[PDB]
Amino acid sequence: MVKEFNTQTELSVRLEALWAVLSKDFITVVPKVLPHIVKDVQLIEGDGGVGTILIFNFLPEVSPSYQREEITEFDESSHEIGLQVIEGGYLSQGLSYYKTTFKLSEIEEDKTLVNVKISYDHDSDIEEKVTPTKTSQSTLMYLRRLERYLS
Numbered sequence: 001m002v003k004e005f006n007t008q009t010e011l012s013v014r015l016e017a018l019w020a021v022l023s024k025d026f027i028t029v030v031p032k033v034l035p036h037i038v039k040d041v042q043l044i045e046g047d048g049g050v051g052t053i054l055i056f057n058f059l060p061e062v063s064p065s066y067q068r069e070e071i072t073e074f075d076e077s078s079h080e081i082g083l084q085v086i087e088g089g090y091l092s093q094g095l096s097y098y099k100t101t102f103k104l105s106e107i108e109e110d111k112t113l114v115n116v117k118i119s120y121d122h123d124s125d126i127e128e129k130v131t132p133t134k135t136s137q138s139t140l141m142y143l144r145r146l147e148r149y150l151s
């Protein structure tokens, strides 16, 4: 049954700048900020909203070499976006379910809170590399790299 992991980070960026890159402008940015993992991102169906499907192609050394994710929620007024891994990536490493929801809120003009909810499951005992204590660390690293990209 699906379990949850929650964490958060405060970033020294304006909410609207972080929202744009997180929710809309990430196609060219992901490979630039994660050049040690992500080669490119392809938008393959949809126009950026719910149902949009993305392929992340990873570096040649990486197995699986890609991950397919779908935007499963998108709310512009509450600044929430959710992405579910639907093929490859963690699903090829022992997970049966993996979704990441980001919600932004303004702390001050140049401080933005990002709440991160990870939902996941696995049918058997799993390796550390797919524990959400570990997967969340990768996600927080990406968020802090966006902050740096924007600064």
Ligand SMILES: C/C(=C\CNc1ncnc2[nH]cnc12)CO
Pocket: 021, 022, 023, 026, 069, 083, 085, 100, 135, 138, 139, 142
């Ligand atoms: C395109 C976006 C996020 C991309 N996907 C992920 N971003 C950060 N950590 C993850 N873990 C699994 N999938 C992800 C939002 O900018």
Ligand SMILES: C/C(=C\CNc1ncnc2[nH]cnc12)CO
Pocket: 034, 037, 056, 058, 062, 063, 064, 067, 088, 089, 090, 093, 138, 139, 142
């Ligand atoms: C299973 C793999 C990567 C997990 N996916 C991600 N890992 C780290 N950052 C990301 N941004 C978007 N997707 C990811 C490939 O080794």
